[PDB]
Paper text:
In response to the N-formyl peptides from microbes and mitochondria, FPRs play crucial roles in host defense and inflammation. Although FPR1 and FPR2 share 69% sequence identity, these two receptors display distinct ligand-binding preferences. In contrast, FPR2 is promiscuous in ligand binding with recognition to a vast array of ligands with diverse sizes, structures and functions, ranging from small molecules and lipids to peptides and proteins, which enable its involvement in chronic inflammatory diseases such as AD, systemic amyloidosis, and atherosclerosis. In this work, we determined the cryo-electron microscopy (cryo-EM) structures of FPR2 bound to Gi and four peptide agonists with diverse sequences and lengths, including Aβ42, fHN, and two formyl peptides, N-formyl–MLFII (fM5, derivative of bacteria-derived formyl peptide) and N-formyl–MYFINILTL (fM9, mitochondria-derived formyl peptide).
The Aβ42–FPR2–Gi2 structure for the first time provides molecular details that define the recognition of Aβ42, the most toxic form of Aβ, with its receptor. Upon binding to FPR2, the N-terminal residues D1–Y10 of Aβ42 exhibit an elongated conformation and adopt a binding pose nearly perpendicular to the membrane plane, fitting into a binding groove bordered by helices III, V, VI, and VII, and the second and third extracellular loops (ECL2 and ECL3). The cryo-EM map also reveals additional densities for six residues, which may belong to the C terminus of Aβ42. These residues form a β-sheet structure with the N-terminal segment of the peptide and make extra contacts with the extracellular loops of FPR2. The residues D1 and A2 squeeze into a narrow “channel” at the bottom of the ligand-binding pocket and play a critical role in triggering receptor activation. The only polar interactions are hydrogen bonds between side chains of the peptide residue D1 and the residue Q2586.52 in the receptor, as well as between main chains of D1 and the FPR2 residues L1093.36 and F1103.37. The polar residues R2015.38 and R2055.42 in FPR2, which are involved in a polar-interaction network with the N-terminal formylated methionine of the formyl peptides, form hydrogen-bond interactions with main chains of the Aβ42 residues A2 and E3 due to a deeper binding position of Aβ42 compared with the formyl peptides and the absence of N-formyl group in Aβ42. The bulky residue F4 in Aβ42 packs into a shallow subpocket shaped by helices VI and VII, forming hydrophobic contacts with F2576.51, A2616.55, and V2847.35. Residues R5–Y10 of the peptide extend into a narrow binding groove on the extracellular side of the receptor, forming extensive hydrophobic contacts with ECL2 and ECL3. The other parts of Aβ42 may play a role in stabilizing the conformation of the peptide N terminus to enable FPR2 binding and/or is key for initial receptor–peptide recognition.
Residue numbers in the entry:
A (entry chain L): 1 to 10, 37 to 42
B (entry chain A): 6 to 56, 184 to 355
C (entry chain C): 12 to 62
D (entry chain R): 19 to 316
E (entry chain B): 7 to 340
The structure:
């Protein structure tokens, strides 16, 4: 469906 | 060049009509009929006629059917039997009462034995490997009255006995499915012709519906 | 069988030439028209309408 | 630890074999169905699914080299944008084609008359353009919101950034929370709940009707159906569950990082989902006898 | 009576041995083999949705008509791969189709026992059937146009008939075949034609005289194809015994045979090139085998058909050969 991308506007924690 | 492009639109418009008419051809199922010698093939057509070879079109339960009769073709079957490839099913008509009869063309060859020989050819041929047969047994009412007067042992010497309507029909049937070598690939839908309307066409509709499911599963990949 | 025999008489009363003379005529036509056969010799692309 | 390093290397090799088998299988399926086969509704759906899988797999080595060194993107902003949009579009495309193939099979089995009368090539195109439109609608957040940012330490990661949209750090963080929650719930519902409910119901009714009508000559159809449903479940459900857990724990992860297991668990689940996208034509197209005959004839 | 007919047949067979001084292959060994020819599919005609049974090339070498089981008679512009006309048919079961030498008429027939002629030069702009030939009790296997007014049709009732377009019924009826007639071929002078039937025998007929001038018995299986030599002196017969036989009119004897051990499938269509040196014969191996007429050596292969090839035609000038198969595809080879 959608690749998991996690971040904020500027820190976030994600995994490609 | 205007001339080359002028005919380009003609081909595109013709292509649109070809696929639209081709979809209508695939919109309807095709059924082939075999058998002759007053086997009841003509009777099946009249009761299923809701609306050269005989071609008629009728619609039952929002399903469009095609009826083909090849009794007029007196030539060899194998020359034109490959033309009827892709038919949904084959409606084979067998006269139950024809067991105690003799063919006019040959006295040694039985009328019903020729039906099985004709039935065997349409199943063992390579052009109908996956085409199911909707076997139809006709004249069951006339067969019932004559089974008491005349026995089945004349047609089949290797008959156990008990010449009743129920036992003979099972033995008469069992010869036909055993004639089909490709049991797994194709299925024989056997029914007895009934005088009541909406009954015989229902069996054809039910058998065609089962074949359509089987054909769809084969294309999908389940089968 | 009257029709069968009458047709056979007409077929019998024909001139059948030797195979060697007949074979030479078939071979002569092939040689005389070999240059005019686009299938026997590769036709040039410019002359060929099919690209 | 030793297990953690293996748990990190495993997605790399899984994605490499996914790339290889996807390229080969999708290429063969496209070559046979698109050019060497007559157009058919089932053939059309298979071709669209294979095209989506191939387009996803073509850009998959970019994901491999990104996950090789921890989400870092050696390439530019536009190329990362294109790769991510392609991956997202093709993933929703594969999921929606799976769901629509299930729906089409259910329609053909339950209502053979309607399928014979109405399922045509033109109608197939008219109803197959829809899933792609839905994929674009669900991907448009990648179209606008996704950007590329560079960490001051030197590393660069192209992920979501809301400096321009928010305009202030507080508004940007609020917009991040809102959009991430919306995207997570949308993915879980439309991307997972909608097809899984469709796939289970469609294939459930097919098995129910086949068993009721006694068409089970061999265990092959039931085995194929069970394999399809089980593979789709055991592959997509882990990744979707991990994404949903990360979405519902959005504040905890962003502000305090209470749940760190999702951070190391997304990669194996993503690799499993991509392996499912790879294997979809293997049991959706190769199972057909006619396709095998055409392939061996080619 | 019966003994005389049997004795006459032996007398004809004895005359064959007298004329058989030397085979063609021994005589033609001196000429250089043509060799291997690389033929590619120049154009692919993809407009049919059912198997194709017959096709005919035009005199202008650009328009060809193809008959398929979908019920549509399509005239193809081979130069630009375009469809000039699409003709719906009353019966979708058609075995043969013909194209008039002038190009204004196209005829097809099949299991409907009716040979329908359609005019392509209608003033209104829509193609409609002009005449419907009725009187055949067997399936129409082959039909060829002698001219805009005379057409000969081969039927499945072991009988071949010559029809008149304006008159509406058969003018001359040709009888003598034991098996069902399957193929027809018209000589360039149009005066004579040959027919191949199911009795493993192909015989020559006269348009004017209306009886069998010569009968050839060299096949051992069902003959399905026939075609005259470009000069009209000889013709080739394709049967189901995987062999093609060349018969000479002026010799009344099988000149030579086209046989290969590897192929065991029958021939569905056959014709000749412009010079007649190159023989092209369809087969059931999903491909066309191209033979050398003189030496019976393979010169090329026209593989590329997903299904069995049933029709094959070489245009009058021999520019290209078109093969139609059961995969609803027509390939232009050159």
């Amino acid at each position: 469906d959608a690749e998991f991308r996690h971040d904020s506007g500027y820190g976030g924690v994600v995994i490609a | 060049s205007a001339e080359d492009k002028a005919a380009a639109e003609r081909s595109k418009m013709i292509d649109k009509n070809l696929r639209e008419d081709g979809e209508k051809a695939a919109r309807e199922v095709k059924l082939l009929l075999l058998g002759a010698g007053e086997s009841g093939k003509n009777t099946i057509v009249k009761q299923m006629k809701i609306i050269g070879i005989v071609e008629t079109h009728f619609t039952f339960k929002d399903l469009h059917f095609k009826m083909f009769d090849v009794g007029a073709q007196r030539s060899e079957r194998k020359k034109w039997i490959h033309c009827f490839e892709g038919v949904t099913a084959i409606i084979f008509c067998v006269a139950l009462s024809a067991y105690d009869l003799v063919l006019a063309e040959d006295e040694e060859m039985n009328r019903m034995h020729a039906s099985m020989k004709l039935f065997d050819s349409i199943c063992n041929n390579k052009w109908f490997t996956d085409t199911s047969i909707i076997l139809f047994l006709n004249k069951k009412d006339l067969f019932e009255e004559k089974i008491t007067h005349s026995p089945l042992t004349i047609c089949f010497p290797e008959y156990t006995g008990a010449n009743k309507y129920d036992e003979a029909a099972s033995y008469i049937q069992s010869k036909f499915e055993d004639l089909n070598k490709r049991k797994d690939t194709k299925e024989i839908y056997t029914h007895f012709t009934c005088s009541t309307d909406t009954k015989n066409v229902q069996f054809v509709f039910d058998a065609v519906t089962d074949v359509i499911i089987k054909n769809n599963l084969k294309d999908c990949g389940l089968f | 069988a009257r029709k069968l025999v009458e047709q056979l008489k007409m077929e019998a009363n024909i001139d059948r030439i030797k195979v060697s003379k007949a074979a030479a005529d078939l071979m002569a036509y092939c040689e005389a028209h070999a240059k005019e056969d686009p299938l026997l010799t590769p036709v040039p692309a410019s002359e060929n309408p099919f690209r | 630890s030793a297990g953690y390093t293996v748990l990190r290397i495993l997605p790399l090799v899984v994605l490499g074999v996914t790339f290889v088998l996807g390229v080969l299988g999708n290429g063969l399926v496209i070559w046979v169905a698109g050019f060497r086969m007559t157009r058919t509704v089932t053939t059309i759906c298979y071709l669209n699914l294979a095209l989506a899988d191939f387009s996803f797999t073509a850009t998959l080595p970019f994901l491999i080299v990104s996950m090789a060194m921890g989400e870092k993107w050696p390439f530019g902003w536009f190329l990362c944008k294109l790769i991510h949009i392609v991956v997202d579009i093709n993933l929703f495309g594969s999921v929606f084609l799976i769901g629509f193939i299930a729906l089409d099979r259910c329609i053909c089995v339950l209502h053979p008359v309607w399928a014979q009368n109405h399922r045509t090539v033109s109608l197939a195109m008219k109803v197959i353009v829809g899933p792609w439109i839905l994929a674009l609608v669900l991907t448009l957040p990648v179209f606008l919101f996704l950007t590329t940012v560079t960490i001051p330490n030197g590393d660069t990661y192209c992920t979501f950034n809301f400096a321009s949209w928010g305009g202030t750090p507080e508004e940007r963080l609020k917009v991040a929370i809102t959009m991430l929650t919306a995207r997570g719930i949308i993915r879980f519902v439309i991307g997972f709940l909608l097809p899984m409910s469709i796939v289970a119901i469609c294939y459930g009714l097919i098995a129910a009707k086949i068993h009721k009508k006694g068409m089970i000559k061999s265990s092959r159809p039931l085995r194929v159906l069970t394999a399809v449903v089980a593979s789709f479940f055991i592959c997509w459900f882990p990744f979707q569950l991990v994404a949903l857990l990360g979405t519902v724990w959005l504040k905890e992860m962003l502000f305090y990082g209470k749940y760190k297991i999702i951070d190391i668990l997304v990669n194996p689940t993503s690799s499993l989902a991509f392996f499912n996208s790879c294997l979809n034509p293997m049991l959706y197209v190769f199972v057909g006898q006619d396709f095998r005959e055409r392939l061996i004839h080619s | 009576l019966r003994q005389e007919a049997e004795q006459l047949k032996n007398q004809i067979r004895d005359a064959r041995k007298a004329c058989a001084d030397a085979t063609l292959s021994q005589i033609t060994n001196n000429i250089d083999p043509v060799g291997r020819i690389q033929m590619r599919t120049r154009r692919t005609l993809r407009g049919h949705l059912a198997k194709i049974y017959a096709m005919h090339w035009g005199t202008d070498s650009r328009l060809l008509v193809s008959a398929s089981q979908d019920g549509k008679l399509i005239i193809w512009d081979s130069y630009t791969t375009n469809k000039v006309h699409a003709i719906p048919l009353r019966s979708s079961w058609v075995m043969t189709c013909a194209y008039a030498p002038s190009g204004n008429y196209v005829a097809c027939g099949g299991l409907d026992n009716i040979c329908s002629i359609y005019n392509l030069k209608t003033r209104e702009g829509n193609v409609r059937v002009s005449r419907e030939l009725a009187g055949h009790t067997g399936y129409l296997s082959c039909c060829r146009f002698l001219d805009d007014n005379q057409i000969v049709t081969s039927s499945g009732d072991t009988t071949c008939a010559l029809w008149d377009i304006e008159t509406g019924q058969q003018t001359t009826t040709f009888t003598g075949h034991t098996g069902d007639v399957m193929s027809l071929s018209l000589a360039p002078d149009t005066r004579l034609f040959v027919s191949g039937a199911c009795d493993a025998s192909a015989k020559l007929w006269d348009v004017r005289e209306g009886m069998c001038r010569q009968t050839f018995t060299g096949h051992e299986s069902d003959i399905n194809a026939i075609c005259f030599f470009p000069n009209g002196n000889a013709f080739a017969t394709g049967s189901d015994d995987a062999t093609c036989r060349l018969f000479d009119l002026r010799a009344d004897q099988e000149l030579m045979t086209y046989s290969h051990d590897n192929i065991i499938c029958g021939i569905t269509s056959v014709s000749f090139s412009k010079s007649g040196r190159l023989l092209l014969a369809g087969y059931d191996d999903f491909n066309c085998n191209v033979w050398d007429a003189l030496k019976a050596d393979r010169a090329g292969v026209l593989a590329g058909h997903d299904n069995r090839v049933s029709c094959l035609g070489v245009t009058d000038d021999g520019m290209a050969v078109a093969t139609g198969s059961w995969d609803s595809f027509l390939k232009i080879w050159n």
